[PDB]
Symmetry: C3
Subunit: 114 residues, 3 copies
């Protein structure tokens, strides 16, 4: 799986250990080994949410399976909780796009996961 | 909705009011309430379009519905027009990917929109 | 087609000619004229793959058709080979998400490809 967060929060406000924490929490939440979890944080962005430039985050989680109605609700509680706690972004200023990827449409290690 | 534009145009060439104009005009075009519209501009990017590094843009628009043949043509005209007038980017050097997201696959405020 | 690579490799380790090489090789692989190929490289990113900060890349390839099992395997071998040779990224530290875009869902030059 792959989690990306884009945010206007400054680089200095991203805690040491944030990428590791996301990796571990996502490994546990998706039930996949941490070796397959990729995380990407992009601070200092020029963005707005509802016309305001207060802290916000625009995010995506891609996974081959483990994406669905209840699971996505659970990921959203988890990830909004982490963004609130670690980056001080209000949950109602977070968007997360979830993508259930077909294995044939994910490239890795010179091939795909098909 | 979520609108993102990545461009090789320098930050200094992005005018004051650009995120606000995007927010307002997308609210107009999509019908969506402006308080739920998020916008993101990423200048100074290392990119080429057709092998050339003249000004260009790669964009996305994600929305729960309001995506379709006619609506996307309307959005493209609006958005290319905005990038041409505001960023001096030729419309034939812009790509916009449109995504009709299932409400269950959009996280917000500790849950999803389903 | 549009190809995006996000990487923690620093800008100075991206060799001159890289965007043109991606442009030309993707034109050949997809059987599409290079005028249609857009490429975007984003170095210096804060990212981890498997909880490690060793060089890695998170990429996407969007195309209107020419996406599928065998094609995506071929694209992956091509693109991992390029990232390994040029950016010194191990192939098993690369994810490429493939998207088969519907012509109606790609904006360009004030309209869409529909
Ligand atoms: C008085 O208004 C009551 C609330 O009405 C609405 C109507 C449409 C809405 N539409 C949305 C919405 C959010 N998106 C969306 C946002 C981000 C994204 O990555 C993908 C889709 N698309 N639509 C959210 C809240 C809404 C609330």
């Amino acid at each position: 799986p792959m989690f990306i967060v884009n945010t206007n929060v400054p680089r200095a406000s991203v805690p040491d250990g944030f990428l590791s924490e996301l990796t571990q929490q996502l490994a546990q939440a998706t039930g996949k080994p941490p070796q397959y979890i990729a995380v990407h944080v992009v601070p200092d962005q020029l963005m707005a949410f509802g016309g305001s430039s207060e802290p916000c985050a625009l995010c995506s989680l891609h996974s081959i399976g483990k994406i669905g109605g209840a699971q996505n609700r659970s990921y959203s509680k988890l990830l909004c909780g982490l963004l609130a706690e670690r980056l001080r972004i209000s949950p109602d200023r977070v968007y997360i796009n979830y993508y259930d990827m077909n294995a044939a449409n994910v490239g890795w290690n010179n091939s795909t996961f098909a």
